[PDB]
Structure formats: structure tokens, C-alpha cells
Design a protein around this ligand. Structure first.
Ligand SMILES: *[C@@H]1O[C@H](CO)[C@@H](O[C@@H]2O[C@H](CO)[C@@H](O[C@@H]3O[C@H](CO[C@H]4O[C@H](CO)[C@@H](O)[C@H](O)[C@@H]4O)[C@@H](O)[C@H](O[C@H]4O[C@H](CO)[C@@H](O)[C@H](O)[C@@H]4O[C@H]4O[C@H](CO)[C@@H](O)[C@H](O)[C@@H]4O)[C@@H]3O)[C@H](O)[C@H]2NC(C)=O)[C@H](O)[C@H]1NC(C)=O
Ligand SMILES: *[C@@H]1O[C@H](CO)[C@@H](O[C@@H]2O[C@H](CO)[C@@H](O[C@@H]3O[C@H](CO)[C@@H](O)[C@H](O[C@H]4O[C@H](CO)[C@@H](O)[C@H](O)[C@@H]4O)[C@@H]3O)[C@H](O)[C@H]2NC(C)=O)[C@H](O)[C@H]1NC(C)=O
Ligand SMILES: *[C@@H]1O[C@H](CO)[C@@H](O[C@@H]2O[C@H](CO)[C@@H](O[C@@H]3O[C@H](CO)[C@@H](O)[C@H](O[C@H]4O[C@H](CO)[C@@H](O)[C@H](O)[C@@H]4O)[C@@H]3O)[C@H](O)[C@H]2NC(C)=O)[C@H](O)[C@H]1NC(C)=O
Ligand SMILES: *[C@@H]1O[C@H](CO)[C@@H](O[C@@H]2O[C@H](CO)[C@@H](O[C@@H]3O[C@H](CO)[C@@H](O)[C@H](O)[C@@H]3O)[C@H](O)[C@H]2NC(C)=O)[C@H](O)[C@H]1NC(C)=O
Ligand SMILES: *[C@@H]1O[C@H](CO)[C@@H](O[C@@H]2O[C@H](CO)[C@@H](O)[C@H](O)[C@H]2NC(C)=O)[C@H](O)[C@H]1NC(C)=O
Ligand SMILES: *[C@@H]1O[C@H](CO)[C@@H](O[C@@H]2O[C@H](CO)[C@@H](O)[C@H](O)[C@H]2NC(C)=O)[C@H](O)[C@H]1NC(C)=O
Ligand SMILES: *[C@@H]1O[C@H](CO)[C@@H](O[C@@H]2O[C@H](CO)[C@@H](O)[C@H](O)[C@H]2NC(C)=O)[C@H](O)[C@H]1NC(C)=O
Ligand SMILES: *[C@@H]1O[C@H](CO)[C@@H](O[C@@H]2O[C@H](CO)[C@@H](O)[C@H](O)[C@H]2NC(C)=O)[C@H](O)[C@H]1NC(C)=O
Ligand SMILES: *[C@@H]1O[C@H](CO)[C@@H](O[C@@H]2O[C@H](CO)[C@@H](O)[C@H](O)[C@H]2NC(C)=O)[C@H](O)[C@H]1NC(C)=O
Ligand SMILES: *[C@@H]1O[C@H](CO)[C@@H](O)[C@H](O)[C@H]1NC(C)=O
Ligand SMILES: *[C@@H]1O[C@H](CO)[C@@H](O)[C@H](O)[C@H]1NC(C)=O
Ligand SMILES: *[C@@H]1O[C@H](CO)[C@@H](O)[C@H](O)[C@H]1NC(C)=O
Ligand SMILES: *[C@@H]1O[C@H](CO)[C@@H](O)[C@H](O)[C@H]1NC(C)=O
Ligand SMILES: *[C@@H]1O[C@H](CO)[C@@H](O)[C@H](O)[C@H]1NC(C)=O
Ligand SMILES: *[C@@H]1O[C@H](CO)[C@@H](O)[C@H](O)[C@H]1NC(C)=O
Ligand SMILES: *[C@@H]1O[C@H](CO)[C@@H](O)[C@H](O)[C@H]1NC(C)=O
Lengths: 435, 115, 38
């Protein structure tokens, strides 16, 4: 004798394919076009909700990859196009009255403000941004269109809060030690997330969150080799980096009100860009990693490391932003170690050789070419180390290499804690009412 | 906003009054406030057809058929929480939705018009 | 080589990838897409 009733109950906890918007806070490329950020002290803790995540399958990563590429292209719109310079550039080595031996002093023609008058000037460039044809073409005039970035915006990661649309909910477990997924018991809900920084690199994350107690290795299929194995780090490592060149930046106007910057001259101490890493700090890191890879591969396994295989240095070496300059730094002195058999496996600083480029291709979108305006003074930027990417290559011996290339894995590295639920508040539970 | 959905059953229906007042309160962000306002509409579209016109925790007069997992509906009413029982009755939703419009809302709507 | 009689073999200049270098090539066109001003 049961008579069904109708409710407005809480259990709505379905999948949420959805849109999303931001809560960020000068006209720097984020543009503050989100909302003013609320103090949102509403991590409402819930009691005993068995819910399993899937960090590898969500649309939050897919939208985040779509947002920033569209947002960073939006900052690229009002800047100077600046493609009259793809001409027959001719250069030589930098002259030093005599010595032995990364710069090219370049003879160069160009238009002026007026349409007919030409301009024979000279400037400097690096190695990897110019190609032999002595005549030297630019590196991208196969197929591109060079574009200057406007010299007022900053490429600094300004953190982005995310908030749910009006009618959905952002969920996060405060629980511990996922294997990527996991039925996390304790959970709290939020309307708005915390601030996440717009950083971008490969082979090493930086300025990120920290771990709980140890390394948390994250993957999908450890028995698959084609995965990108994520490594969460417990304790951050100070990385100092520099471009120790006192450099003079001059300015010209290429046409009708189109300014342009170029490396005029350097004051005279030709150096190489580099980064210091504390040696004894780094060996203390890797002992934690092999401590866990015994548990996932075996007690009698040999953990080897090597460099990247090949490809472009964007794939090979460490991509790295710093303060309006886009470094590329070789990291061969970081994976020259082999840990053996998983049983009884200071005041120093290793230093890496780092290169400088100016013509970039962000997220491999071929055709778009953004120019790097060289800046005056010196370069110093300090960053933590938080995230690592390793790749199991295809006996119990095993070699790992620093993988990377997809920037989605960087955002997935710092958004595994979240999920979003759709809301359908309708419950039909029978009782004995009838009337 | 939300709370106590985890470990209770029926006593969660005591606090079904905060669950609506915070609810619903370029182009890519403008998909929000359209499907967000299409929701709270399309259910209240059919909620007026259920007979319960506004917000009342209310009963209809259509029978609960006991073919739909007849399991101790005084006992499971209080102990065994929601999100478990919801999967049990996840299969029989559409059929009740035909019974929301035929029992009370084909017969009984045209029985007060006799006077 | 000789015959009697909708195509035009056209001398033609054009830019290149680089801004200054020119390009003397030839191509073909129809009748109704080109006009006398030879
Ligand atoms: C990981 O996270 C760390 C910190 O969490 C972050 O390090 C920070 O990096 C930023 C950018 O690389 C640093 O900000 C710059 O700092 C320099 C130095 O400022 C110090 O010294 C001056 C004078 O000695 C003091 O006044 C100042 O208070 C500091 O003590 C500044 O010079 C920079 O400001 C200029 O640049 C900005 C962007 O161009 C402008 O918005 C700003 O107005 C300044 O511009 C002026 O000078 C320019 C010089 O060329 C000129 O071009 C302009 O037209 C204008 O005249 C800037 O504030 C910050 O200090 C770092 N903090 C720490 C603790 O290290 C890492 O960058 C991050 N990792 C990555 C990859 O981002
Ligand atoms: C402008 O400067 C750049 C570098 O700053 C310079 O490019 C370099 O030129 C040298 C000499 O042509 C190349 O050096 C070769 O390097 C290999 C390995 O390092 C050596 O084994 C070579 O020695 C053999 O070849 C010589 C050729 O005559 C023989 O004389 C010699 O006995 C050996 O058989 C040789 O030293 C170097 O490869 C390039 N660098 C690059 C990146 O190509 C360039 O030449 C300078 N510009 C001008 C106009 O000189
Ligand atoms: C490239 O080829 C095209 C065609 O493939 C050619 O254009 C043609 O040229 C001829 C000769 O100049 C034109 O032919 C005329 O056509 C009318 C009717 O068809 C005839 O009656 C004309 O004959 C009279 O005019 C002649 C002029 O001297 C007299 O000699 C003659 O006795 C008659 O009085 C004449 O044959 C024809 O009109 C054009 N076609 C078009 C579409 O205009 C062109 O000449 C070739 N290029 C070069 C450089 O020769
Ligand atoms: C990267 O650069 C930073 C600074 O640019 C380095 O931090 C510096 O580290 C040294 C020692 O590691 C600190 O010196 C010590 O300071 C204490 C405090 O007074 C003093 O008592 C000691 O005798 C010693 O001199 C220094 O203060 C510190 N500076 C800052 C600003 O933090 C860091 O070590 C560099 N890391 C690497 C790997 O090179
Ligand atoms: C653009 O032109 C340059 C001409 O040097 C090409 O550069 C070389 O191309 C060969 C063949 O692909 C490669 O083996 C070399 O490694 C290239 N050199 C460098 C420095 O990358 C380049 O491939 C051309 N690009 C396209 C798309 O045609
Ligand atoms: C992880 O990936 C590997 C290969 O990508 C899968 O291994 C296959 O497993 C089946 C049955 O265990 C074998 O018949 C195949 O021969 C294996 N593949 C190869 C290339 O040898 C493995 O199943 C994946 N793990 C999961 C959980 O899906
Ligand atoms: C690149 O070569 C040019 C050659 O003209 C150098 O320009 C000359 O530099 C000397 C002293 O450095 C000046 O007295 C001349 O006036 C400069 N010429 C012109 C036309 O301005 C230039 O210095 C070289 N680049 C570097 C970095 O040394
Ligand atoms: C980064 O530095 C390493 C230093 O070892 C370079 O690797 C060597 O390259 C030569 C020829 O390219 C080989 O004969 C050696 O066997 C390599 N050693 C190792 C450890 O790989 C590497 O080429 C550098 N990469 C860049 C992009 O500069
Ligand atoms: C790198 O991570 C360390 C974590 O230990 C940061 O150090 C602390 O950061 C918090 C908040 O950022 C501060 O309240 C503490 O005062 C910091 N402690 C010390 C000893 O510095 C550090 O700030 C991070 N690096 C950067 C550049 O932010
Ligand atoms: C060396 O070169 C510098 C600049 O390149 C020049 O000023 C100087 O006169 C030169 N000295 C000699 C001895 O050639
Ligand atoms: C630049 O132009 C001048 C004349 O305009 C010419 O003499 C010179 O050779 C050009 N430079 C190069 C590198 O072609
Ligand atoms: C990882 O966790 C899932 C459940 O979230 C479990 O099914 C799987 O066996 C776990 N794998 C390992 C290696 O612990
Ligand atoms: C670079 O050299 C110039 C002189 O040419 C000097 O004024 C400036 O202070 C130098 N840069 C630094 C960082 O000292
Ligand atoms: C790191 O230190 C351990 C002992 O603390 C040592 O056995 C190991 O060889 C060191 N790493 C390298 C690469 O030498
Ligand atoms: C005829 O023309 C063709 C191509 O136009 C040429 O290859 C051939 O040599 C010519 N023959 C004579 C006899 O002119
Ligand atoms: C094409 O250019 C060359 C020199 O650049 C010139 O001699 C020739 O006459 C031009 N062709 C035409 C059809 O004008």
C-alpha cells in the first residue's frame, strides 16, 4: 500500500560535460576579464561519500587547454604584424679583433616610414633563429608570418581561480595518495577553486603545488610503455637561472607607426646562459623515486636514466620561460645516473648549458610565429621544482627518460583533485500518503 | 549551499530549503545563464503537471507499483542512504513520468469540472 | 609548331618568399578570365 511522493532532494551526482568560467581578480594578457574574486570560505566538508575520480578523462583539462591558447592569441592581436623583414639577410660572425669562437652581426635592409626610402642597418641574432642559404634566411620563412609581441604585457603566471556556473558544483577530495584515480572517501564541495598559475614548460614543472608526504607516481597503465609517467615531488628545489649579458636594446620604426626593437650591441663580456642546481639536494630527491619504483616494478630491478632521444630541442631539452625571455636549456647533467638492484643502491652546484631563442612556435601550431623582444639589464628568475615527466622506454633492468610535449599533461598535473557534477534535483520516494 | 548529502536518509529532506535559494543565483561564457535558466524551468515545466504546483514536500494519489524493487519501504526509508537507493530506482523513472500525467492528471483534473 | 586555332601561354612576373627577389614564370589561362590592354 505504497503511494509515491515527489521531492527536491540533494543526490544529483551525475557526469558534467559543461562550460566553465574564471575568477582571476594592468592589461596583461589575462586582462582580469573574469569576475572579482570572492573570499569563498566554503569548503563545506561532507561525511563519507564514496566517490571515485578519473583524472585522465575529464573536460576540465580539455577546456583549460582551449582557454589559454585562445586567450594568449587574443593578446597577440593588436600588436605589430611586422613582416617586411623577411628579406635577404646576410651576416658574419661577431668580430673581436682576433680570438677563437652564438651571435651573428647581420647586414640588413628594411623599409622606412615613407614607402620608398630604404634603410641599411645592422643588428644581432642568435644561432637557432637563422639559416644558411653569405646569405642567411630567417628560420621560419618556409611557411609562417613573423609577429612581434607588444612590449608592455608580461609573461608572468598570474593565478586563475575557477568558479562553477550557476547550477553546478565543483567537487574536490582532500584525501591522500591517489594512484591517479581512486574512490576517495572524504570530500568537500566548493563553488570556486583556488588560484592556479599559468606556467608552461616541459620535462620539469615549476612554481606548482607540493605533495603530501612522498612521491606520488601517476599514470594510467604502468605495464604500458607509451604512457607519460607523472612524478609528484615532495620537497621543492631552488633553481637560479640567468642570462649574464649586459645588452643594449635599440628601437626603430619600420613603417607607418610600427615600432620595432632589436639587439643593438652588448657591452662586452660574452657569456652563456645557465642554471645552477644544488647537487646534494638533487641526489636526495632521486632516492625517494627509486624507493617507490621498486614497489611498482620489482625488488631486483635496475633503474637507469638517460637524456632525451632526439627530435627538436623543444621535445629534447627543457623548455623554459623566464621574465619575458624563452629559454631552452640542455639537461644532460640531471639524468646521468643508474640505480641498481633496489638493494643498497655537498657545497656543490651542477650547472646546465642553456640556449637563447627568439622565434618560437607555441603549442606546435604551425604558421603562427611570435617574436621575442630582447630586454635590457640582466636576467634573474628563481623557481621551485614540483613536477616531473618520465617515460618508460620500450632482464629486470629499466631505463627512464624525461618525456613531454603535450602541455595538457601540465594542467592535468595540477587539476587531478577536482571534479564537476551536473545537478538534477528530483527524487521520487514512496510512502503511505495516498491523498 | 550543499551539505549532509553523504550520511543520512530522509533527515536530508528536513533541510531541503537551502537547496534552492542559492540555486540559480563573451559568447563562450554565455552558454551559461541559458542552459542554467533552461534548468529550473524544464522540471518546473513538468512539476506543474505533477499536481504539486509550488514547493511543498507533497504526496500525489498515483500508486507506487510494488514491481519497482519492493524492499522494506519503512525500513530503507531511514537507514539506507540516498545515492544507493537512487541507483535502485534509476531504471524506473520514465515510466513514473507517464504515470504523473495519467493518474491524477487525466482523470482527476476532469473530475472537479463536474460541478 | 603550326596548326589552326581557348588557352593563353602567359609571360609572368611575381614575388617570392623573400621580399625583394622576383620570379619570372609562365602558366596557362582560359579566354574569359583575361582581357586585352601584347
Ligand atoms: C616562479 O615564481 C617566482 C616567484 O614566485 C617568479 O620570480 C619572479 O619573477 C618575476 C618576473 O621574472 C620578477 O619580477 C620582476 O622583478 C624585477 C626585479 O625587481 C626587483 O628589483 C627592483 C629594483 O632592483 C625593485 O624595485 C623590485 O621591488 C624588486 O626588488 C623587476 O625589475 C620587474 O619589474 C619590471 O618588469 C615588469 C614586466 O616587464 C614590469 O611590469 C615592471 O613594471 C618593471 O618594468 C620596468 O622595468 C623593466 C626593466 O626592463 C622595463 O622594461 C619596464 O618598461 C619598466 O621600466 C619584475 O617585477 C620577480 O621579482 C620574481 N620574484 C622572485 C621572488 O624571484 C618566477 O618568475 C616564476 N617562474 C616563471 C617561469 O615565471
Ligand atoms: C663563424 O664562426 C663559426 C663558429 O663560431 C664557424 O663555424 C665553424 O667553423 C669551423 C671551421 O670551418 C668548423 O669546425 C670543424 O669542426 C669539427 C668538429 O668541431 C672539426 O673536426 C673540423 O676539423 C676538420 O675540418 C677542417 C676543415 O678544413 C680541417 O681543416 C681540420 O683539419 C679537420 O679535418 C672543423 O674544425 C665548425 O663545424 C663550424 N661550426 C658549425 C656549427 O658548423 C664559422 O666557420 C665562422 N665563419 C666563417 C666565415 O669562418
Ligand atoms: C591567337 O589566336 C586567336 C584565336 O585562336 C586569334 O584571334 C583571332 O584572329 C583572327 C585573325 O585576326 C580573327 O579572325 C577574323 O574572324 C572573322 C570571323 O571569324 C573573319 O571574317 C575575319 O576575316 C576577315 O578579316 C581578316 C583580317 O585581316 C581578313 O584578312 C580577311 O580576308 C577577312 O576580311 C578574320 O579571319 C578572329 O576574330 C580572332 N579571334 C577573336 C576572338 O578575336 C589571334 O589573332 C591569335 N593571336 C595572334 C597574335 O595572331
Ligand atoms: C639560488 O639563489 C638564492 C639567492 O639568490 C640562494 O639563496 C641563498 O642561499 C645561501 C645559502 O644557501 C644563503 O646564505 C646563508 O644565509 C644565512 C642567513 O643570514 C647566513 O647566516 C649563512 O651564513 C649563509 O650566508 C642566502 O641567504 C640565500 N639568499 C636568499 C635571498 O635566499 C640559493 O642558495 C641559490 N640556490 C642555488 C642552488 O644556487
Ligand atoms: C624550410 O627550409 C629549410 C632549408 O634549410 C629546411 O631545413 C632543413 O630541412 C631538412 C629536410 O627537412 C632537414 O633535414 C634539416 O634538419 C632542416 N634544417 C633545420 C635547421 O631544421 C626546412 O625543413 C624547411 N621546412 C619546410 C616545412 O619545408
Ligand atoms: C596496458 O597496455 C598493455 C599493452 O599496451 C596491455 O598488454 C596486453 O595484455 C594482453 C592481455 O593481458 C596481452 O594479450 C597483450 O599481448 C598485451 N599487449 C602487448 C603489446 O603485449 C595491457 O592489457 C594494458 N593494461 C590494461 C589494464 O589495460
Ligand atoms: C657589426 O659590424 C659593424 C660594421 O659596420 C659594426 O658597426 C661599426 O662599429 C664601429 C665600432 O664598433 C663604429 O665606429 C661604426 O660606426 C659602426 N658602423 C656603423 C655603420 O654603425 C658593429 O659594431 C658590429 N657589431 C658588433 C656587435 O660589434
Ligand atoms: C646536451 O649535452 C649533451 C652532453 O653530453 C650532448 O650529448 C652528446 O652529444 C654528442 C653528439 O651530439 C654525442 O656524441 C654524445 O654521446 C652525447 N652525450 C650524451 C650524454 O647524450 C647533447 O647533444 C646536448 N644537447 C643539446 C641540444 O645541446
Ligand atoms: C617554493 O616552495 C616553498 C615551500 O616550502 C615556499 O616557501 C614558503 O612559501 C610559503 C608560501 O609561498 C611562505 O609563506 C613561506 O614563508 C615560505 N618559506 C620559505 C622558507 O621561504 C616558496 O615560497 C616557494 N618558492 C616561491 C618562489 O614561491
Ligand atoms: C679592435 O676592435 C675594436 C672594435 O671592434 C676597435 O675599436 C679597435 O680599434 C680595434 N683594435 C685593433 C688594434 O684593431
Ligand atoms: C642593402 O641595400 C643596398 C642598397 O639599397 C645594397 O647595396 C646592399 O647590398 C644591400 N644589402 C644586402 C645584404 O643585400
Ligand atoms: C589503482 O586504483 C584503482 C581504483 O581506483 C584499482 O582498481 C587499481 O587496481 C589500482 N592500481 C594499483 C597498481 O594500485
Ligand atoms: C651595462 O653597461 C652600461 C654602460 O654601457 C652601464 O650603464 C650599466 O649599468 C651596465 N649594466 C649593469 C647591470 O650594470
Ligand atoms: C647519492 O647518494 C647515495 C648515498 O647517499 C650514493 O650511494 C649514490 O651513489 C649517490 N648518487 C650518485 C649518482 O652517485
Ligand atoms: C615542336 O614543338 C615542340 C614543343 O613545342 C618541340 O619539342 C619540337 O622540337 C618542335 N618541333 C619542330 C619540328 O619544330
Ligand atoms: C618580367 O621581369 C623582367 C625583369 O624582372 C623583365 O625583363 C620582363 O620584361 C618582365 N616581363 C613582363 C611580361 O613584363
Amino acid at each position: 500500500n505504497l503511494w509515491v511522493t515527489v521531492y527536491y532532494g540533494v543526490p544529483v551526482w551525475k557526469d558534467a560535460e559543461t562550460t566553465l568560467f574564471c575568477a582571476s581578480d594592468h592589461n596583461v594578457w589575462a586582462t582580469h576579464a573574469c569576475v572579482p574574486t570572492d573570499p569563498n570560505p566554503q569548503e563545506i566538508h561532507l561525511e563519507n561519500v564514496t566517490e571515485e575520480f578519473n583524472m585522465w578523462k575529464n573536460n576540465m583539462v580539455e577546456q583549460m587547454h582551449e582557454d589559454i591558447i585562445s586567450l594568449w592569441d587574443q593578446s597577440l592581436k593588436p600588436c605589430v604584424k611586422l613582416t617586411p623583414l623577411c628579406v635577404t639577410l646576410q651576416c658574419t660572425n661577431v668580430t673581436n679583433n682576433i680570438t677563437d669562437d652564438e651571435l651573428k652581426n647581420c647586414s640588413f635592409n628594411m623599409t622606412t616610414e615613407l614607402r620608398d626610402k630604404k634603410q641599411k642597418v645592422y643588428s644581432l641574432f642568435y644561432r637557432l633563429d637563422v639559416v644558411q642559404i653569405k646569405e642567411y634566411r630567417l628560420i621560419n620563412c618556409n611557411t609562417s608570418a613573423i609577429t612581434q609581441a607588444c612590449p608592455k604585457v608580461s609573461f608572468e603566471p598570474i593565478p586563475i581561480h575557477y568558479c562553477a556556473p550557476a547550477g553546478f558544483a565543483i567537487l574536490k577530495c582532500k584525501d591522500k595518495k591517489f594512484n591517479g584515480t581512486g574512490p576517495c572517501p572524504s570530500v568537500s564541495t566548493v563553488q570556486c577553486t583556488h588560484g592556479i598559475k599559468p606556467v608552461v614548460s616541459t620535462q620539469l614543472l615549476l612554481n606548482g603545488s607540493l605533495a603530501e608526504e612522498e612521491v606520488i607516481i601517476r599514470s594510467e597503465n604502468i605495464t604500458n610503455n607509451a604512457k607519460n609517467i607523472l612524478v609528484q615531488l615532495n620537497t621543492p628545489v631552488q633553481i637560479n637561472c640567468t642570462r649574464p649579458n649586459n645588452n643594449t636594446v635599440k628601437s626603430i620604426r619600420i613603417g607607418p607607426g610600427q615600432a620595432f626593437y632589436y639587439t643593438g650591441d652588448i657591452i662586452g663580456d660574452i657569456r652563456q646562459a645557465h642554471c645552477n642546481v644544488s647537487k646534494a639536494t638533487w641526489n636526495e630527491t632521486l632516492g625517494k623515486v627509486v624507493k617507490q619504483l621498486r614497489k611498482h616494478f620489482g625488488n631486483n630491478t635496475i633503474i637507469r636514466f638517460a637524456q632525451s632521444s632526439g627530435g627538436d630541442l623543444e621535445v629534447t631539452t627543457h623548455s623554459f620561460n623566464c621574465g619575458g625571455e624563452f629559454f631552452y636549456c640542455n639537461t644532460s647533467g640531471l639524468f646521468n645516473s643508474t640505480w641498481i638492484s633496489n638493494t643498497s643502491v655537498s657545497n656543490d652546484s651542477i650547472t646546465l648549458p642553456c640556449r637563447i631563442k627568439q622565434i618560437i612556435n607555441m603549442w606546435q601550431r604551425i604558421g603562427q610565429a611570435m617574436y621575442a623582444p630582447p630586454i635590457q639589464g640582466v636576467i634573474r628568475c628563481v623557481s621551485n621544482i614540483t613536477g616531473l615527466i618520465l617515460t618508460r622506454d620500450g632482464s629486470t633492468t629499466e631505463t627512464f627518460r624525461p618525456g613531454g610535449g603535450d602541455m595538457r599533461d601540465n594542467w592535468r598535473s595540477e587539476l587531478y583533485k577536482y571534479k564537476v557534477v551536473k545537478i538534477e534535483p528530483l527524487g521520487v520516494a514512496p510512502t503511505r500518503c495516498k491523498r | 549551499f550543499l551539505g549532509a548529502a553523504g550520511s543520512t536518509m530522509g533527515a536530508a529532506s528536513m533541510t531541503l530549503t537551502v537547496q534552492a535559494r542559492n540555486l540559480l543565483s563573451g559568447i563562450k561564457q554565455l552558454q551559461a545563464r541559458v542552459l542554467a535558466v533552461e534548468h529550473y524551468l524544464r522540471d518546473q515545466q513538468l512539476l506543474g503537471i505533477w499536481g504539486c504546483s509550488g514547493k511543498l514536500i507533497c504526496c500525489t494519489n498515483v500508486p507506487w507499483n510494488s514491481s519497482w524493487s519492493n524492499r522494506n519501504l519503512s525500513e530503507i526509508w531511514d537507514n539506507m542512504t540516498w545515492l544507493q537507493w537512487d541507483k535502485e530506482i534509476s531504471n524506473y523513472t520514465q515510466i513514473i513520468y507517464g504515470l504523473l500525467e495519467e493518474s491524477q492528471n487525466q482523470q482527476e483534473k476532469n473530475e472537479q469540472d463536474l460541478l
